[PDB]
């Protein structure tokens, strides 16, 4: 869930910068990652 | 041959409005006025300054994210007693000491410094109870 | 809120309607007279002063006799304030009696505990002894005084000293019976203080 190496896995994954922190969100629940 | 002064000093009363000014960008010229660096008869051991009164202390402002960044620590003498409160609640609840802390920080240390601090006056709101002394307006250089 | 003050008499027992024994304490009360009124504009807050248990003339000076001139009564021995009351229904010189309390009400009681003098660590703070045999030379004395590094003793170390005789509050006490003819109150439990002391009896403020 954290994985300080944030990187897309799914083909629909997107990279977001909420609150100055790198995020990834996919429709599959097992993909959320926070840079940190 | 240079002329020192004692018991021949004359004081004045100045009103300073702090509406949009930065916290530390007026509390330095105020300190300079308090010490008395703007008189040609300045003397380092006599306290030749004059009184200032500050109104509208609630309208001072910070920059960046200092409204949540700055923290004030006041450890007592008991073990583990390190208290703290952020700058936002400091301004909303204790504006007077918020300004007084900075002014006192930029003043010399010792008995003379304590007297110089004694001659300061800080108020919230817009009115002051010193009309008998007939104060006058001062426009800070900035 | 509400409340009066009096003295304390002793302890006893009472058999309830369910033939059950309950300990009891007796309060003397007697009528209380209001002496002054404080207002927000004049004083900054709202309160009423109370007077109780008048004394003879020789035991009062002139300011004291002047103060009670308005309420039109004799000088009184005890006076104290009571905050949070409804500011109406109260006039200077009015009488306040024991009927203000009902049989089943809940109350807090405040007093001053008995003095105990210079007491030691074991009794004053409830510490432990050392062994009394096996070649031990440490029985009833305070423990170590902290580490070595600070080069000093912390603030908060516990040592012998004068014990007792301070102000204490005990909350959530029931009332048993009210005896208006003799001006009596019957609380249930114990109460801080020696016999013939001053006890404040105020209505409960939750906890």
């Amino acid at each position: 869930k954290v994985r300080p190496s944030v990187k897309p896995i799914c083909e629909k994954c997107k990279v977001i910068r909420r609150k100055g922190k790198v995020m990834v969100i996919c429709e599959n629940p097992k993909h959320k990652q926070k840079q940190g | 041959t240079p002329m020192a002064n004692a018991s021949t000093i004359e004081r004045k009363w100045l009103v300073v409005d702090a509406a949009g000014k930065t916290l530390g960008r007026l509390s330095s010229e105020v300190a300079a006025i308090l010490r008395g660096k703007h008189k040609p008869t300045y003397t380092p051991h006599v306290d030749t300054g004059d009184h200032v009164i500050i109104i509208n202390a609630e309208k001072i402002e910070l920059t960046g994210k200092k409204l949540t960044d700055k923290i004030y620590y006041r450890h007592t003498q008991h073990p583990g007693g390190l208290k703290s409160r952020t700058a936002l609640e400091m301004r909303t609840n204790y504006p007077e000491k918020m300004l007084e802390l900075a002014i006192k920080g930029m003043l010399p240390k010792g008995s003379l410094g304590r007297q110089m601090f004694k001659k300061l006056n800080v108020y919230r709101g817009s009115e002051h109870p010193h009309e008998a002394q007939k104060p006058e307006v001062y426009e800070l250089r900035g | 809120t509400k409340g009066i003050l009096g003295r304390k008499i002793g302890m006893t027992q009472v058999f309830a309607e369910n033939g059950d024994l309950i300990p009891v304490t007796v309060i003397e009360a007697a009528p209380n007279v209001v002496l002054q009124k404080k207002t927000a504009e004049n004083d900054g807050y709202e309160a009423i002063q109370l007077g109780f248990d008048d004394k003879r003339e020789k035991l009062s000076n002139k300011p004291e006799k002047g103060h009670v001139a308005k309420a039109e009564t004799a000088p009184k021995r005890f006076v104290k304030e009571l905050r949070g009351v409804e500011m109406d229904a109260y006039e200077v010189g009015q009488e306040v009696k024991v009927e203000i309390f009902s049989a089943g009400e809940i109350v807090d009681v405040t007093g001053v505990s008995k003095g105990k003098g210079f007491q030691g660590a074991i009794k004053r703070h409830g510490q432990s002894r050392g062994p009394m045999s096996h070649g031990s030379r440490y029985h009833r004395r305070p423990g170590s005084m902290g580490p070595v590094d600070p080069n000093r003793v912390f603030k908060g170390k516990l040592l012998p000293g004068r014990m007792g005789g301070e102000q204490i509050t005990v909350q959530n006490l029931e009332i048993v019976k009210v005896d208006a003819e003799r001006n009596l109150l019957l609380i249930k439990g114990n109460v801080p203080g020696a016999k013939k002391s001053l006890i404040t009896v105020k209505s409960a403020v939750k906890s």
């Binding site: - | 040609p40 008869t41 300045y42 | -």
Partner: protein, 58 residues
């Protein structure tokens, strides 16, 4: 000495540094700082030198 000169010069619309540069640049006033302070504490003669420097600063 320097502090008192600075205050008096600021009263006139200048700084100490600019006033000193103008004085040394104009007519080589070789007056030191001590007599400058005496002329400050007893002024209206201090101001004349200030406008003398202001003239050459342009």
């Amino acid at each position: 000495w320097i502090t008192r000169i600075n205050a008096a010069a600021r009263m006139n619309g200048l700084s100490y540094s600019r006033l000193m540069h103008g004085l040394k640049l104009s007519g080589i006033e070789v007056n030191r700082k001590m007599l400058a302070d005496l002329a400050v504490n007893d002024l209206t003669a201090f101001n004349q030198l200030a406008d003398a420097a202001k003239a050459q600063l342009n």
